[PDB]
Ligand binder design. Structure first.
Ligand SMILES: CCCCCCCCCCCCCCCC(=O)OC[C@H](COP(=O)([O-])OCC[N+](C)(C)C)OC(=O)CCCCCCCCCCCCCCC
Ligand SMILES: CCCCCCCCCCCCCCCC(=O)OC[C@H](COP(=O)([O-])OCC[N+](C)(C)C)OC(=O)CCCCCCCCCCCCCCC
Ligand SMILES: CCCCCCCCCCCCCCCC(=O)OC[C@H](COP(=O)([O-])OCC[N+](C)(C)C)OC(=O)CCCCCCCCCCCCCCC
Ligand SMILES: CCCCCCCCCCCCCCCC(=O)OC[C@H](COP(=O)(O)OCCN)OC(=O)CCCCCCCCCCCCCCC
Ligand SMILES: CCCCCCCCCCCCCCCC(=O)OC[C@H](COP(=O)(O)OCCN)OC(=O)CCCCCCCCCCCCCCC
Ligand SMILES: CCCCCCCCCCCCCCCC(=O)OC[C@H](COP(=O)(O)OCCN)OC(=O)CCCCCCCCCCCCCCC
Ligand code: HEC
Ligand code: HEM
Ligand code: HEM
Lengths: 57, 385, 62, 93, 247, 75, 50
């Protein structure tokens, strides 16, 4: 089942660079939101939204 | 024939970066030139996108730099890329020169390449100093006036030259506007000098880490050495991204963020660290005119290095004594840069004098003696008469 | 030694010289490098031309 | 164009090297090979061989200059204490 | 030189922002702005910090707008010609307490208090030095030293004698949240606020650094692999030389 | 009910075996310099002995003992 | 005022004409601003303050 994968993805270069660009789209967006979610959960209570909810409650 | 070999611009790009025959056995030290070209393009690009916001008055220089740091979008990135890529530029340049004077590529078919490289080194020291005196901090202004007061030690002509260079009577608004114009201008002379470096290389081909002829089996540039350059470019980008994002101010002095006040002296007027060995060579001998001419002799005494090497084998790869004395010279250069950061004090003045004597004696005294000794040792160990 | 007898390569070779499997593996690796470098080149270009937009004092006094 | 002066490197086909005969060169395409072949064996053994052959030339001058710098620095820190001020004047003049 | 003229080296404290992944404590930035406004606003200017950078970091927009009304600013004059004064909006800068530098030297015995907008970035040691300078005032200088009149002793100041008296006393301010105001608590809060106002790019810089070094280290590993792939045909070529027959 | 934590921590580290020895050296300084200051002819001696060596040693020991614990004690 | 010497008036005449205008001097020991008579380096003053 590797011949079908090679035929539909890496045979012609146009679908190769199109796959690379669409993967760049979805990778950049989910990588950005995942790394900012981790960076804002590693600091809990130190961010401004947490301080604002703390002084609002 | 092919279109990449027929068209006139593409034939140049082909013959330089596609199928330029490089020797088959070059290691990772030969990628420092590609790294220097990339980092020069990085410096020029971030410099243009900072000079679109930098205003070069005396009332607006440091305020405009901290306006870049605080208000323009991603300006902290641009300023830290410039101020750290200059340090990385000089460290990769020091690696380039040390590779060149270790592997014997100052030798008989590329002495004009070595001389053009020394010209590039002088020009980039000059524009790096001008860029450091654009920002107008406390190290900046006083380092400028210290080395121009150094430059006024010429006997008949010196005060007239230094009050032509200042644009006045001390380092002020005309000096800072002058230094911004020159700090823009000189890297576009370095770009032409790097084009000259590439031509003077390409007429003869690169050396290999053995000394022997690369002309037997060579390798085209495109599918192999571009990817070796890609490995070292991504490693250099990783180390540069670390030094830009996680500790940006761990290289520069923590006194350049005080605004330039020409009344107070900060009691330690050291420059940025790549000028520290030449500053130690300067502060070695107590007189001043002799100090600046021995700093200039310390810079252009790399030109006597092709004419003073008497070894019949190219490079220190298959030598022992010259390997030992070359690493003595390198750690002496690092010690000289360490001495240039301290005050003129109790072992430091004698250590600076002895270190600059060992620096000046590696090129003039030590290397023809040990090269002659190694030649005679090779002959009397080989032949049996 | 004859000039038709090749030296051994049986340590640097693989057991299954499939065309599609090895070609797909190599092209997936070069495509992953191209994907990461594409996202990086996009982000640094938009960094450089996001510097040239309106600075925060102009947006404040808008 | 102008045929300039001859150098020690031509181009592909006439590279200016010596004439060779009888040197057969066998190679294998990387798609038939395994990259990362022997990276742990050559990471433990060959790297130790290179470090064993080329570390005295680096560590003896580094040791000399580091001991000189450490001795000078601790002598300066001795002198600018209180137990060296008579030595400070004697070294001054 | 001597360690008295060098200044005693500040220790290595355990900050809440020391590290590659940690950030500023924004509640400490709010309390440090309160300590700056009630204590350090009498001498020290803070001019490169606009009011609008404070929004979304330590106070809300309504709090910063109600804080900026308390200060007069020079307006462009009216139709008659004489100059006018206006209450400040968000785009203005935090005003200094002295109109020029001669008044700053006249009200503080000839010593100019430096601008605090870049004071943890333009000092050796940084926030450790600022905290130890604020707290490490001894009650009397040690036996033997002589100070000029009007100059106090602080060992972390390089020189020994600083012109700034010990100002951070116990319960000088009272925090609006309930934190007990010692002098060490006020010192830590005001040096965290000075760290913020010297580098406001801290959070975004460390976040983009995490992104960039993850992407670049993965690119470095993939490029090492593709280099070994492209050179697998050159690392493993074999040369065979049989000697040719003579002619 | 609450005052300084840093002064409490320095007072706690001024009673260790190392701290009492460094403190004792500093008051050997203190009374030696006081006796030397009491003498006539103190307007000019060419070397007026202060005591900052012992105070710097004491403060350096106190700060290298105090640096980890204080920010855990604070809020 | 220094461009005016050697062209239409002499140096003493321009130095006597520059005294009739007051200019902003940097403030003294107390901090309050002072005024000074003009010298040859200052510009010719306009009649309206803004
Ligand atoms: C320094 C770190 C690297 C030290 C080091 O690795 O040295 C060992 C190599 C040996 O050189 P080699 O080319 O590998 O020769 C051995 C080859 N065999 C025979 C085994 C096949 O030697 C080298 O790799 C040559 C590196 C020398 C140049 C790099 C060091 C540059 C440091 C800064 C120098 C500043 C100089 C300023 C000049 C104005
Ligand atoms: C501009 C100078 C500074 C910027 C300078 C940047 C560096 C210098 C330019 C490098 C640009 C690289 C473009 C590569 C063009 C290309 O041929 O891509 C094809 C590759 C795969 O090609 P292959 O490995 O030969 O396989 C083909 C064989 N099949 C699979 C068909 C059987 O597929 C891929 O490579 C995947 C796509 C990766 C996209 C490239 C990422 C970098 C883009 C930079 C673009 C810069 C040019 C902008 C021009 C306005
Ligand atoms: C690195 C630690 C290696 C310690 C030394 C050792 O365990 O022996 C060497 C082996 C051989 O591993 P190698 O260096 O990749 O050689 C490949 C073997 N061939 C294919 C040539 C037959 O090394 C290994 O197989 C160790 C593999 C460990 C993988 C995880 C490392 C973390
Ligand atoms: C648009 C796509 C058109 C594709 C047509 C095609 O495929 O281009 C095929 C041609 C070759 O064609 P040929 O010689 O086989 O034709 C024979 C007809 N008689 O290569 C080219 O044009 C360009 C070659 C690409 C490689 C060099 C790229 C260098 C870019 C400049 C970088 C400069 C940086 C340093 C300064
Ligand atoms: C020659 C012209 C280019 C010169 C400069 C680039 C080369 C040196 C790069 C050194 C690392 C510093 C990154 C600065 C830009 C930045 O801040 O990168 C931040 C981004 C993610 O940030 P983001 O998307 O969240 O936000 C963007 C808005 N602030 O990281 C990356 O995507 C990876 C960047 C490195 C990959 C480079 C690939 C090759 C590019 C060639 C052009
Ligand atoms: C003017 C003249 C003044 C002369 C004064 C002395 C100057 C320096 C002389 C040379 C110093 C280095 C000598 C050793 C070279 C070396 O690196 O040996 C390194 C040697 C081995 O090396 P190998 O290649 O046999 O390893 C081959 C491995 N396959 O490890 C040792 O033996 C063991 C350690 C001994 C201690
Ligand atoms: C006067 C009524 C002051 C108050 C209240 C504060 N400071 Fe101060 N400071 C003042 C003067 C006159 C000087 C000059 C002394 C000198 O010679 O520099 C200073 C100095 C500082 C410094 C500089 C130390 C250095 O190494 O340059 C800092 C970092 C400083 N002051 C900070 C500071 C803080 C954080 C304060 C309150 C929370 C504060 N000062 C109060 C005058 C006065
Ligand atoms: C040869 C390459 C270059 C080097 C080595 C170099 C080096 C430097 C250095 C070290 C500084 C001081 C940074 C600091 O304050 O610490 C600087 C400042 C500066 N350089 Fe360059 N520079 C180079 C090319 C350029 C070019 C070509 C430009 C113009 C397009 C430029 C624009 C600036 C500007 C505007 C500053 C002002 C201060 C700042 O914002 O960083 N640089 N340069
Ligand atoms: C702006 C800085 C520079 C750039 C961009 C640059 C660029 C290059 C490049 C691309 C190469 C070919 C790759 C290589 O052989 O390593 C090279 C080779 C060389 N450069 Fe430079 N160079 C610079 C500065 C210098 C300096 C300062 C010197 C020394 C004075 C120098 C001397 C050499 C030598 C001797 C070689 C030949 C190395 C060999 O073939 O063995 N260069 N340079």
């Amino acid at each position: 089942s590797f011949s079908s994968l090679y035929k539909t993805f890496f045979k012609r270069n146009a679908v190769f660079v199109g796959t690379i660009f669409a993967g760049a789209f979805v990778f950049q967006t989910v990588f950005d939101t995942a790394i900012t979610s981790w960076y804002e959960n590693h600091n809990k209570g130190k961010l401004w939204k947490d301080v604002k909810a703390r002084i609002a409650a | 024939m092919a279109f990449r070999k027929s068209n006139v611009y593409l034939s140049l790009v082909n013959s330089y970066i596609i199928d330029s025959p490089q020797p088959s056995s070059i290691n990772y030290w030969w990628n420092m030139g590609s790294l220097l070209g990339l980092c020069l393009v990085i410096q020029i690009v971030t410099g243009i996108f900072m000079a679109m916001h930098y205003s070069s008055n005396i009332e607006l220089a440091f305020s405009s730099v901290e306006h870049i740091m605080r208000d323009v979008h991603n300006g902290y990135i641009l300023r830290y890329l410039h101020a750290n890529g200059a340090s990385f530029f000089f460290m990769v340049m020091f690696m380039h020169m040390a590779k060149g004077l270790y592997y014997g590529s100052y030798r008989s078919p590329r002495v004009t390449l070595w001389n053009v490289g020394v010209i590039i080194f002088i020009l980039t020291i000059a524009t790096a100093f001008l860029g450091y005196c654009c920002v107008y901090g406390q190290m900046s202004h006083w380092g400028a006036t210290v080395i121009t007061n150094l430059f006024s030690a010429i006997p008949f002509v010196g005060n007239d030259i230094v009050s032509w260079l200042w644009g006045g009577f001390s380092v002020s608004n005309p000096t800072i506007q002058r230094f911004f114009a020159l700090h823009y201008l000189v890297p576009f002379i370095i770009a032409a000098m790097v084009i000259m470096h590439l031509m003077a290389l390409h007429i003869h081909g690169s050396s290999n880490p053995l000394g022997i002829t690369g002309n037997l089996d060579r390798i085209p540039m495109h599918s192999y050495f571009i990817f070796k350059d890609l490995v070292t470019v991504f490693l250099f980008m990783l180390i540069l991204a670390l030094f830009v994002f996680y500790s940006p101010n761990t290289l520069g002095h923590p006194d350049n963020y005080i605004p330039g006040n020409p009344l107070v002296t900060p009691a330690s007027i050291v420059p940025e660290w790549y000028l520290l060995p030449f500053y130690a060579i300067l502060r070695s001998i107590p007189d001043k005119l002799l100090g600046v001419i021995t700093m200039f002799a310390a810079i252009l005494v790399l030109l006597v290095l092709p004419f003073t090497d008497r070894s019949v084998v190219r490079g220190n790869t298959f030598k022992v004594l010259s390997k030992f004395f070359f690493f003595i010279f390198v750690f002496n250069f690092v010690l000289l840069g360490q001495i240039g950061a301290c005050h003129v004090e109790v072992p430091y003045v004698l250590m600076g004098q002895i270190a600059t004597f060992i620096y000046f004696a590696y090129f003039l005294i030590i290397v023809p003696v040990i090269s002659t000794i190694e030649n005679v040792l090779f002959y009397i160990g080989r032949v049996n008469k | 030694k004859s000039t038709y007898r090749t030296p051994n390569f049986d340590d640097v070779l693989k057991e299954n010289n499939d065309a599609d499997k090895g070609r797909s593996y190599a092209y997936f690796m070069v495509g992953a490098m191209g994907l990461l470098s594409s996202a990086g080149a996009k982000s640094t270009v938009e960094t450089f031309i996001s510097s040239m937009t309106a600075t925060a004092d102009v947006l404040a006094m808008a | 164009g102008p045929p300039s002066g001859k150098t020690y490197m031509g181009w592909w086909g006439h590279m200016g090297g010596p004439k060779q005969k009888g040197i057969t060169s066998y190679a294998v395409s990387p798609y038939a090979q395994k990259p990362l072949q022997g990276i742990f064996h050559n990471a433990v053994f060959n790297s130790f061989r290179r470090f064993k052959s080329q570390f005295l030339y680096v560590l003896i001058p580094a040791g000399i200059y580091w001991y000189w710098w450490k001795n000078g620095n601790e002598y300066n820190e001795f002198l600018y204490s209180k137990a060296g001020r008579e030595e400070l004047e004697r070294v001054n003049v | 030189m001597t360690a008295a003229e060098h200044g005693l080296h500040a220790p290595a404290y355990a900050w809440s922002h020391n590290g590659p992944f940690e950030t500023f404590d924004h509640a400490s930035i709010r309390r440090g702005y309160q300590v700056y406004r009630e204590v350090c606003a009498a001498c020290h200017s803070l001019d490169r910090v606009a009011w609008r950078t404070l929004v979304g970091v330590s106070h809300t927009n309504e709090e910063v707008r109600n804080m900026a009304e308390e200060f007069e600013y020079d307006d462009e004059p009216d139709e008659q010609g004489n100059p006018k004064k206006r209450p400040g909006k968000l785009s203005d800068y935090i005003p200094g307490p002295y109109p020029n530098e001669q008044a700053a030297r006249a009200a503080n015995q000839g010593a100019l208090p430096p601008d605090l907008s870049l004071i943890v970035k333009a000092r050796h040691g940084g926030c450790d030095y600022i905290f130890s300078l604020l707290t490490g005032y001894p009650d009397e200088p040690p036996a033997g030293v002589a100070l000029p009149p009007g100059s106090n002793y602080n060992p972390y100041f390089p020189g020994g004698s600083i012109a700034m008296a010990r100002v951070l006393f116990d319960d000088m301010v009272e925090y609006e949240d309930g934190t007990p105001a010692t002098t060490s608590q006020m010192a830590k809060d005001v040096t965290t606020f000075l760290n913020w106002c010297a580098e406001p790019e801290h959070d975004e810089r460390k976040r983009l650094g995490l992104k960039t070094v993850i992407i670049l280290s993965s690119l470095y590993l993939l490029s090492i692999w593709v280099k070994k792939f492209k050179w697998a045909g050159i690392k493993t070529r074999k040369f065979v030389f049989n000697p040719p027959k003579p002619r | 009910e609450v005052t300084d934590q840093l002064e409490d921590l320095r007072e706690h580290f001024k009673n260790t075996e190392e701290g009492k020895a460094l403190v004792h050296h500093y008051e050997e300084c203190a009374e030696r310099v006081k006796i030397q200051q009491q003498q006539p002819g103190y307007a000019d001696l060419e070397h007026k002995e202060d005591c900052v060596e012992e105070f710097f040693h004491l403060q350096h020991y106190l700060d290298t003992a105090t640096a980890p614990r204080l920010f855990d004690k604070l809020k």
